[PDB]
Each structure stands twice: as structure tokens, then as C-alpha cells.
């Protein structure tokens, strides 16, 4: 049930933590004037993280479709979508930033690939936002309604800075 969703999400969190460390290394490499190929290799690893995040989010989505089709509990179905919304948030956050980072540094190849993941993540974000709003209207649980509200705010927090 939800345990498998948590397992996939832990992988995404460890991938997000590696992404943050690489972002740290990338900043220090620029500050010290590291060669261009050193930055490319750091950007490539971040791209590979972005692609693994997308693969996980697609996996997370299939498991949520199974929960939404079989689970009779509306609160359990809502929690599945809330967990999937967190995964989509992780995917969009890192892929959108990697695109912007690669563009600012002048790596069109990596910016274009990251942009493709961000655009796919954006359609996933919009789809899960529709389901999140439908949960607030359909599930009477105040904490599940509150959680759907925050998960929307979470997903929208990326596009504010961008």
C-alpha cells in the first residue's frame, strides 16, 4: 500500500540530497575557477539525478493509480496522491533549477535536456494539482483537506522564484 510509496519517496529524497551536494560542489567549482569539463561532469551528474527522479515519479504515479483503483478508503487514496505530489515537487524543483543553472552557465546541451524533464514534470504538477483540489472538495477530513492545500502551495513554490 502506502509503504511502497514511501520507499520510492525515500529514494527521491536521497537523490535530492545528492543533487544538493552536487549543487554545492558546482558553486565551489565556479568560485575557484575550475575548468569547463569539471563543471560539465558536475552538471552531467545532476542531469542523471534529474532523469532518475523522473523515472521514480513515473513509477510513483503507477502505484498511485493502483491505489486509486483498488483502495476503498478515501483517506488512504488521498494520502497516496499527497505522497505522489511530494515526488512531483522534488522532480520539478531540481529539474527546473538544473535547466536554469545550465542556461546561466552556457551549457545548452544540458539545459535542453533538463528543460525536457522540467516540461514533463510541469504537466505532472498540473495533473496532480487538479487531483489535489478534487480531494479538498471530496474528502471531509480537515487534516487531509489541510494537507492538500499545503501540497498545492508546495508545488507552486517552485514557479514563484523562477
Amino acid at each position: 500500500m502506502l509503504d511502497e510509496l514511501f520507499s520510492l519517496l525515500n529514494k527521491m529524497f536521497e537523490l535530492s540530497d545528492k543533487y544538493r551536494e552536487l549543487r554545492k560542489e558546482l558553486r565551489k567549482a565556479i568560485e575557484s575557477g575550475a575548468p569547463e569539463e569539471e563543471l560539465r561532469e558536475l552538471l552531467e551528474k545532476m542531469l542523471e539525478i534529474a532523469k532518475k527522479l523522473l523515472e521514480l515519479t513515473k513509477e510513483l504515479k503507477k502505484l498511485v493509480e493502483d491505489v486509486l483503483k483498488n483502495n476503498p478508503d478515501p483517506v488512504e487514496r488521498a494520502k497516496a496522491v499527497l505522497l505522489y505530489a511530494v515526488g512531483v515537487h522534488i522532480l520539478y524543483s531540481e529539474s527546473s533549477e538544473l535547466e536554469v543553472i545550465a542556461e546561466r552557465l552556457g551549457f545548452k546541451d544540458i539545459a535542453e535536456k533538463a528543460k525536457e524533464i522540467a516540461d514533463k514534470a510541469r504537466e505532472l504538477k498540473e495533473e496532480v494539482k487538479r487531483k489535489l483540489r478534487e480531494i479538498r472538495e471530496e474528502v471531509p477530513d480537515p487534516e487531509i483537506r489541510k494537507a492538500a492545500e499545503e501540497a498545492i502551495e508546495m508545488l507552486e513554490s517552485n514557479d514563484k522564484r523562477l
Binding site: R20, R23, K79, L82, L83, V86, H89, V100, I101, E150
Partner: peptide, 25 residues
Amino acid sequence: GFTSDYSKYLDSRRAQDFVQWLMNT
């Protein structure tokens, strides 16, 4: 403008705390 390393860490902490809330509620 790029968000700071710590602000990035807070966003991950909030998302993790959110997921942790879901499985203990």
C-alpha cells in the same frame, strides 16, 4: 537569483517532515 544552499535544505526538510506527517497520521 539562485536560492541559498540552506534554503534548498529547508525545502527538503519541509517536504520530508510533510511525508513523515502523512505516515504517522
